[PDB]
Subunit: 494 residues, 3 copies
Amino acid sequence: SDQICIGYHANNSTEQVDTIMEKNVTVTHAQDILEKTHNGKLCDLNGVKPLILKDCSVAGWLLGNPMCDEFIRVPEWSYIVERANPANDLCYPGNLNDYEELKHLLSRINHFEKILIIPKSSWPDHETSLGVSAACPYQGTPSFFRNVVWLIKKNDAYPTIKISYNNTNREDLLILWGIHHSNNAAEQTNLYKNPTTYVSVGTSTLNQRLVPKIATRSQVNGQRGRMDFFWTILKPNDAIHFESNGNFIAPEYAYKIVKKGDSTIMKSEVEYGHCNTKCQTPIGAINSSMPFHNIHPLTIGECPKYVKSNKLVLATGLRNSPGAIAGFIEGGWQGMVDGWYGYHHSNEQGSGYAADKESTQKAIDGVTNKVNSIIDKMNTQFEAVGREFNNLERRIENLNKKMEDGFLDVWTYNAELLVLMENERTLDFHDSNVKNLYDKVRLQLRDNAKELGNGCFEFYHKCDNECMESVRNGTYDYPQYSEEARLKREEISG
Amino acid sequence: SDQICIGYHANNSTEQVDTIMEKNVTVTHAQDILEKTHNGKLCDLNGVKPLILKDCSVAGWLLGNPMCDEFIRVPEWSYIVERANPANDLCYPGNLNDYEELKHLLSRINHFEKILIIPKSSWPDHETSLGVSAACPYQGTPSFFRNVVWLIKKNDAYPTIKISYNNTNREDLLILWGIHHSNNAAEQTNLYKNPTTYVSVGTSTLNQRLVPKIATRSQVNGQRGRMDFFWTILKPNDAIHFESNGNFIAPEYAYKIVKKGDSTIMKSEVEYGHCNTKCQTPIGAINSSMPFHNIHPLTIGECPKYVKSNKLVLATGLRNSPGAIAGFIEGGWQGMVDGWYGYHHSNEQGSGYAADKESTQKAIDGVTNKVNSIIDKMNTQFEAVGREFNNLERRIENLNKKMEDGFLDVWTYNAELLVLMENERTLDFHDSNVKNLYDKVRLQLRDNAKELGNGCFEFYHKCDNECMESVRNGTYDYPQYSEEARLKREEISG
Amino acid sequence: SDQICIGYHANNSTEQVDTIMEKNVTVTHAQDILEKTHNGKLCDLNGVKPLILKDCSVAGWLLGNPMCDEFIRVPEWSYIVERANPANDLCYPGNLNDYEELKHLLSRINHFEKILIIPKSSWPDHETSLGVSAACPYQGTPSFFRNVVWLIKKNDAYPTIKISYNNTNREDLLILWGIHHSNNAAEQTNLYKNPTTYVSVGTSTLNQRLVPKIATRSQVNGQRGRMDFFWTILKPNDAIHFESNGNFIAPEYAYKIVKKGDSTIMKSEVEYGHCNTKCQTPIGAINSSMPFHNIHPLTIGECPKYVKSNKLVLATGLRNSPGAIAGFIEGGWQGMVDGWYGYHHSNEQGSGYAADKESTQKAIDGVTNKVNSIIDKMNTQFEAVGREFNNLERRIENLNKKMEDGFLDVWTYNAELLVLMENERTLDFHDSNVKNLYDKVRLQLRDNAKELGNGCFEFYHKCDNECMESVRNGTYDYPQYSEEARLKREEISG
Ligand SMILES: *[C@@H]1O[C@H](CO)[C@@H](O[C@@H]2O[C@H](CO)[C@@H](O[C@@H]3O[C@H](CO)[C@@H](O)[C@H](O)[C@@H]3O)[C@H](O)[C@H]2NC(C)=O)[C@H](O)[C@H]1NC(C)=O
Ligand SMILES: *[C@@H]1O[C@H](CO)[C@@H](O[C@@H]2O[C@H](CO)[C@@H](O)[C@H](O)[C@H]2NC(C)=O)[C@H](O)[C@H]1NC(C)=O
Ligand SMILES: *[C@@H]1O[C@H](CO)[C@@H](O[C@@H]2O[C@H](CO)[C@@H](O)[C@H](O)[C@H]2NC(C)=O)[C@H](O)[C@H]1NC(C)=O
Ligand SMILES: *[C@@H]1O[C@H](CO)[C@@H](O)[C@H](O)[C@H]1NC(C)=O
Ligand SMILES: *[C@@H]1O[C@H](CO)[C@@H](O)[C@H](O)[C@H]1NC(C)=O
Ligand SMILES: *[C@@H]1O[C@H](CO)[C@@H](O)[C@H](O)[C@H]1NC(C)=O
């Protein structure tokens, strides 16, 4: 007697997934949605190269530390790369005011151009070539920051400087200047003539007065003196006014600056790779559409959500053993190779496996749609994650840390449990589809066949391969065989 | 050829929903939980009107910029509305110290009353009516901030001012004063007699000393001088002590202030609408119990969660085609109008429809309960979202931006995937209810009935319409009919 | 006549759960995953005791308010406990600079040792014991901070102090000093001889100059004078240099400091309980593996996620009523006691209950695994939640408040909806298991038994207890009884 059986795909896969109720469940196909790979390279960000200060800090680069070795200034960059402890930074010891805000402002710059705004010819009554220190050596000779001029008395006199510069360019000007804290009255009168001095700086918004602190300090880079640097953004058609009778570190060069987007400073030792990316980490770039990653927290760009997890494996295929699906249908079919759910016939032209095209295709569509929903519903926007707070801003640094940790906890929990729940529902989806197929066949045949209890029906008539693929194609004629079935059904012993 | 069939509700609805596995699925009823509408108006917040500063800033309003409204009498407000760039703000150029913290303090005030604390009679040895400037015109002629007094020398002398004020009121006092940075020694001697001057201010907590910075600056509103203003909160029974020999901008009016909660500053040009609301946005107010909205991020009040989404549509009804639904039941019944699941019979009396009332009521209750759970479990508390950090606080503002973006991403992902998953579970719930109905009669009928294979049953006797409503009301009597059925059953072959 | 029935566990439990579709559903067993209990004590944190300042503030403890203990007996601590308003705090009025950052630095200290760095023998030409005030009582008599020295003129002279201290220890040194703001020229010359004075402090990084503000102030603790204190971290092998000609409040003691982690300051009056914990709240400690709690927001340690909820009750057992459960199987069996799903048989030998162990064990395993997944997938890391921003940092405090509120909203919503959805699915899981068991038996028996419509089958042959235990084990011998069954079936009809 001919029979027809309902079954499902099996294969050689050893891939495992977890569900909310079961762990280490072998399946026929799975997919990780957690991005774990990076190119180990520093790349352009959306087509724009980073500004890689390799042996210089932002401060030394800006002021023109003569000990920083190379300076092919670039007119635009997407982020700044410093390494962890730059060797060259403020050769003469001191400070750059509002340094962290300045670095954040310079993180991403649309246009950057160094220009000469006050040449040394502007100081006819002051010495312009002796403002030089062994703390800032160039090629064995004492020197100084190149973009600023350390003015010194001339003929034992330091006349009061009163000068102004109008920003006649059409871009903002980043301007830097400084004041020198000398060590004692003798050094004060040696460098400048006047013992009590000041530096006044004024713009439309700036109203600054600095007085040197002549006091004992510890030696740093061989110097007990200090130099405090300050900066401003001079808008077009505004003028900056300087006045000073000593200790003035005057601007010489400044920077035309056009700023649009923001970014941060990345600390990294990885090397530039002539690549492009939308998501950069300090150990490499990420090219991924996945919603989650575990590579590094300090990312710049449009990145997946950072989670603490080793794998996020969604089940795509069926339960695999290399109620349905290991219930009343005892097991899977390695023999069925071209589908997920299908049939196995046996008449007397032969045996074979044949996949049910329609339910297999709709289950594949549904599982693919589920994966694509878990991926595509993730909103990813540009974010720049750095560490931009100083030693006296640790409360804000802790606020940021609590924010980062909270978002990591939220995303980790949500992703893990989403994977578990949707894996369990995918396996149940397979179970219900298989049972629905068995019932579709049961309702095509009714009492022209006997249920055998293992997923198979036994025909009360002969069912040729046209009758068989008519059972698969949805095309079984019950009233036709109604009596070939009738007579063999009542002819049953025993 | 008598028949009875199991079926479900259908209608003309074209509403679509998405599930995690299927897109654009038409259903009989749906409900959006995403709020997308606003009244386009600025409203009271929980019964308290906002302080709408027309074309004036908080600074100009507080100090009494003469182009600012002096006849402003709002003793209470819930939030402040500024325009993007107010025209009237510090007519005489300069600064108001801790301006952003002061605006945050003033965001929501329970009581606000301007009072005279130091009358102009208090300065007998100084000129009180010469402190007037073209930078602060009233009706085109020179004037000054109205709540503060620019004291000028008298008879070429400026005696040292030593004055105090004890807060004998019962509320905190917001007190403002200032110092004038003159331009040169000549102007210094012209306005005040003394070349070297100061302003000292003392309370229980304040210990302030201000010295004028006499230097060259750029012209702003026609003035190269500056005025730096400062403020304090004088607690009841505490006294403020002022001392100065020049450049003093003395208090005249101050503000009794009672604060019982915070809010923020809203930037908006939308107009007041004499309305009330629990959630205000810069483009309109929101009246909604929904858990999510997509109108605007900078909201004040008890608002739904802001997400980046165009619709969040939950399925309430069933799959609509204008292992059950679209499985063996070819389609739904437009004819059944008063329920979700039910029956359709056809015998010699006629055909008709009857809904299974009790499973229909339980499905409606469950779907309504699911919608109400997705809505009611949302915790919504008061939050005030603004932009309160200045140009040199970009790191903190980026921290706030990262927080807002992270919460938007979290809520968007969670809402989208919750809607998808619960829609899939709702549709499967309908499928299971219909299959359970197909089975409930099958087990009431057993071998008193024949399965017909497309959702319909065949009776093994003819069953009057009282027997039918016994099949539906749960009380069909099997030993009643069993041998009328068995004798005719043993007769249909055929 | 012989029968076998499918049924499920019941008991007398009245515990209720909610699902996303049903409220107040009685079940056989439930489990709350919300931690709600605390031990009402302040405990060690991961083995490290807290530093409990009793009625002293960090300022009074550090400077040595004579009413404060030395708190030298704890060399390490995990967090600091202050009362809401410490009584002993800066007895002489004034300020401690960067006080909040200093408290954050001192929140958790790995090693802490008070050492003498400048003994009073270092001041041979200054008075060291007259710096005493009624604002700083010891036993009702005027005194002063003990770890700092109020230097006063000697023989109507105050020679210029120039002193240095080299950090010859191998840990960082916390060093504090101050300046005294006198009230008038007469008091200035009375305490120090020189009318115009200064204090200069220098290290490798510090470059500070302080000038006294001689001005009129309000009385605080009976004094109109003030004292402004400052602090620095002197790194090993660096030296601090002090210079001053008056008003100098000089250091005597300092603190060796070893820091390895941070924390926060907890405000609490609860007492130390000689306990240990991983999560501390201001009202008691928490010992819990649960993922959520509702006890208190200001926690320190590895805590559950704080949510706004009274219960998060997951269903573990079955639906209990003292589409299977209440579908065709009318109700549960109080009589069946060692299983969840099972059978009830009746033949010649007797009637009894027998659990289907295999489905019972895997359902128990799955439910336990679901609970353990909801618990274990929670990532919990160390966090310290305090209130560390001052009266002029309300914008940052509001940013932190918005972050905390946002995370509470997220966690509350997610936990509530997770419990609702997983309760739904657990109940549906039980129903599906019962239906699968009924189908296992139905497909073993086929036409050797009649379905009875209530969960029971009636045998068309005699089924002894071995035949019964073959039906339970899934291995019923259909061809063995099939022909007796067909003959008795053809006999009974009829
Ligand atoms: C910095 O330099 C610019 C000049 O490059 C200064 O702005 C200039 O101001 C003059 C008048 O103040 C403008 O001239 C023209 O004057 C007639 C008056 O009859 C007026 O009708 C024209 O529309 C125009 O205003 C000149 O265009 C303008 N230049 C620019 C580039 O705006 C500026 O004031 C200087 N800043 C300081 C602080 O000195
Ligand atoms: C401000 O004024 C009030 C009184 O107008 C002062 O408070 C009084 O202080 C004396 C003690 O010296 C008490 O006997 C009175 O009962 C107080 N009066 C009130 C109304 O409280 C207060 O000290 C003054 N403050 C300052 C800084 O001078
Ligand atoms: C400050 O203290 C340090 C610690 O001893 C001194 O550094 C040592 O100096 C001696 C001699 O110069 C060396 O042999 C040691 O190797 C140094 N130790 C370290 C860790 O550097 C330092 O010289 C002291 N400075 C002063 C001015 O006394
Ligand atoms: C799951 O499999 C891995 C090996 O691939 C094993 O290390 C782990 O312990 C397994 N987990 C359980 C719960 O059996
Ligand atoms: C769903 O419908 C919208 C129009 O209502 C259409 O734009 C969109 O492409 C449709 N999506 C699919 C997958 O058919
Ligand atoms: C659930 O039970 C509690 C008391 O046990 C009751 O207060 C509450 O109203 C009940 N909920 C419903 C929906 O009946």
